């Protein structure tokens, strides 16, 4: 009973969504060794997680100064929003992964390489996604059920994920972060357009739901990037992803703080993973 709207507006989760929900997804701390050394991440599995079913997966990056535990810590409590939203039927059940760009030689900009080579095969070998295998071919063939997003420095991470991993990821949620590649907004947009051209993908095969707050400094550099992207033929601007593939949600009054950004995820994540989905849904 989710229905797409064409210009979804900011709306915070009800306050009760911030308290624990009895139908709580399990959160598993995992440790793996990859190109940036031994690192950890958290896997949120939906209440009712059944290893015989296939789940969409969304990887979600923290901001500067934070870590893999931030988003499910008491300072953010994203899992309470996820739990209550899934239990109420606003959000189809999914796996949510919070990794880190910290450790070894990792940075927000270069994390996409560890993501492709280590993080995906590590997580999706153990937890049931649409990936039928974790070879490059098997990851690529489940791209429509895989998303990436993040806040601030983790927003920057998302843009670099999109430009380097369109073959593996179809849905993007950059929050309060702009793409640092280029000397003008057009350089940023053209870089994105060129990665799209190289991928071969049609316009119905990638989706960008960006967001920030009207009181968030990230707005000043995001907005011109968004305007340059809108002018590309690669993007059709609308939150109705049955018709287009690009939107920019700007929350009135919101500042550069997880207390607000978590609600951007509540607003946007229910828009993800419906195009070419395996179920029979009317959205």
Domain ranges for the chain: 1-283
Reduced DSSP (H G I as helix, E B as strand, rest coil) percent helix, strand, coil of the chain, to 5: 35, 20, 45
Identify which of 200, 95, 228, 111 has the alpha carbon closest to the alpha carbon of residue 158: 111
Produce one character per residue of 140-169: b if its CB has 16 or more CB atoms within 10 Å, e if not: eebbbbbbbbbbbbbbbbbbbbbbbbbbbb
The strands making up 246-251's β-sheet, listed across from edge to edge, are: 26-34, 37-45, 94-98, 56-61, 146-151, 171-175, 207-213, 246-251
Identify which of 240, 230, 226, 238 has the alpha carbon closest to the alpha carbon of residue 270: 240
3-state class (DSSP) for residue 170: coil
CA dist., res. 154 & res. 265, Å (int) = 13
- Asked if 216 and 250 count as a contact pair (C-beta separation under 8 A), the reply is no
3-state class (DSSP) for residue 115: helix
Resolution of the entry in angstroms? 2.3
CA dist., res. 129 & res. 145, Å (int) = 8
CA dist., res. 198 & res. 162, Å (int) = 12
Beta bridge partners of 250: 212
CA angle 270–29–41, rounded 5-degree value: 65
- Asked if 210 and 247 count as a contact pair (C-beta separation under 8 A), the reply is yes
Solving technique: X-ray
Beta bridge partners of 59: 97, 148
CA dist., res. 25 & res. 44, Å (int) = 6
Please provide the DSSP assignment of 195-250 as one string: HHHHHT--TTS-EEEEEEETT-THHHHHHHHHHHHHTSTT--BBS-TTT--EEEEE
Identify which of 4, 13, 3, 1 has the alpha carbon closest to the alpha carbon of residue 251: 13
Beta bridge partners of 96: 44, 58
Identify which of 90, 88, 72 has the alpha carbon closest to the alpha carbon of residue 80: 72
Architecture of domain 1-283: 3-Layer(aba) Sandwich (3.40)
- Asked if 218 and 227 count as a contact pair (C-beta separation under 8 A), the reply is no
- Whole-angstrom CA distances from 201 to 66, 86, 136, 166, 168 are 34, 31, 17, 8, 11
- Asked if 11 and 89 count as a contact pair (C-beta separation under 8 A), the reply is no
Stated as kind and residue range, the H or E segment containing 184 is none
Beta bridge partners of 32: 39
Residues near 243 by beta carbon (within 8 Å), at least 6 away in sequence: 6, 236
Count of alpha carbons within 13 angstroms of residue 29, beta-carbon side? 9
CA dist., res. 244 & res. 46, Å (int) = 28
- Whole-angstrom CA distances from 174 to 126, 133, 160, 252 are 26, 27, 10, 18
Task: Name residue, tokens 């990792």.
Answer: 106
H-state helical runs in 74-174: 78-88, 111-114, 120-126, 136-140, 153-165
Give me 209's structure tokens. 């739901």
- Whole-angstrom CA distances from 95 to 45, 121, 203 are 5, 15, 25
3-state class (DSSP) for residue 60: strand
């Amino acid at each position: 009973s989710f229905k797409y709207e064409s210009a979804v507006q900011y709306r915070p989760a009800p306050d009760s969504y911030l308290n624990p929900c009895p139908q709580a997804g399990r959160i598993v701390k995992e440790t793996y060794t990859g190109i940036n050394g031994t690192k950890s991440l958290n896997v949120y599995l939906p209440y009712g997680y059944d290893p015989n079913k296939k789940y969409n997966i969304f990887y979600l990056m923290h901001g500067g100064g934070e870590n893999e535990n931030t988003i499910f810590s008491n300072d953010v409590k994203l899992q309470n929003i996820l739990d209550h939203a899934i239990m109420n039927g606003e959000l189809e059940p999914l796996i949510v992964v919070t990794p880190t760009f910290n450790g070894g030689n990792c940075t927000a900009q270069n994390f996409y390489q560890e993501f492709r080579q280590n993080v995906i095969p590590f997580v999706e070998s153990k937890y049931s996604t649409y990936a039928e295998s974790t070879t490059p071919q098997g990851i690529a063939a489940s791209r429509m059920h895989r998303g990436f997003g993040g806040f601030s420095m983790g927003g920057l991470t998302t843009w670099y994920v999109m430009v380097n991993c369109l073959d593996y990821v179809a849905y993007f949620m950059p929050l309060s972060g702009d793409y640092w590649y280029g000397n003008s907004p057009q350089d940023k947009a053209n870089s994105i357009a060129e990665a799209i051209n190289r991928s071969g993908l049609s316009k119905r095969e990638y989706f960008v739901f960006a967001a920030t707050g009207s009181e968030d400094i990230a707005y000043a550099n995001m907005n011109p990037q968004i305007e340059a992207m809108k002018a590309l033929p690669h993007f059709d601007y609308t939150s109705d992803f049955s018709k287009g593939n690009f939107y920019f949600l700007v929350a009135p009054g919101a500042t550069h703080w997880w207390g607000y950004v978590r609600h951007y995820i509540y607003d946007a994540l229910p828009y993800f993973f419906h195009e070419l989905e395996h179920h029979h849904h009317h959205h």
